Amino acid sequence: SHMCDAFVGTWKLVSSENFDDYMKEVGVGFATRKVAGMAKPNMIISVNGDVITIKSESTFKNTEISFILGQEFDEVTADDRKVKSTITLDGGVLVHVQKWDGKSTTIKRKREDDKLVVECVMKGVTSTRVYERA
Numbered sequence: 001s002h003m004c005d006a007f008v009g010t011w012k013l014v015s016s017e018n019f020d021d022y023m024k025e026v027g028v029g030f031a032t033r034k035v036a037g038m039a040k041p042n043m044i045i046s047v048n049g050d051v052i053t054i055k056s057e058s059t060f061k062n063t064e065i066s067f068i069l070g071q072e073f074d075e076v077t078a079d080d081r082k083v084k085s086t087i088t089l090d091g092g093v094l095v096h097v098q099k100w101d102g103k104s105t106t107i108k109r110k111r112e113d114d115k116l117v118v119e120c121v122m123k124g125v126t127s128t129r130v131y132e133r134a
């Protein structure tokens with residue numbers, strides 16, 4: 001019933017690359033980076049009508065956002081930034097832009113084979129986090 005269907009489900013982190021550097025660029029402090037980098041979240045994605053919900057559950061923090069595509073919302077990130085976020089679908093990729101303090105970071109989620117690939121960019125730095133079905 002919608003192309004956003006290939007994201008729905010329960011996903012578990014299986015690989016991370018460059019995440020510490022991404023977090024440094026975002027401005028996350030040492031202790032949060034270390035504990036955050038250890039986390040192995042599950043990502044739970046659901047759809048109800050026009051509302052998409054993404055939950056991240058881990059030993060560090062449980063976070064949840066709900067949103068409508070293209071409609072800005074205020075978000076508290078896991079590292080406690082208060083950001084203005086918009087999430088859109090662009091050619092089959094979920095594109096999440098977070099703005100705060102004159103900065104911006106973009107998080108892209110895409111289906112590739114049986115994985116959900118998360119690419120996180122802050123200025124020159126890209127982190128790639130790969131999830132598989134739980």
Ligand SMILES: Cc1noc(-c2ccc(Cl)cc2NC(=O)C2=C(C(=O)O)CCC2)n1
Pocket residue numbers: 023026028032035036039040041043056058059060061078079107118120129
């Ligand atoms: C920045 C930043 N500072 O702390 C954190 C973070 C902290 C804890 C936990 Cl448990 C996960 C985190 N972040 C993630 O997992 C992220 C992605 C993911 O969903 O893979 C996409 C980008 C961030 N992110």
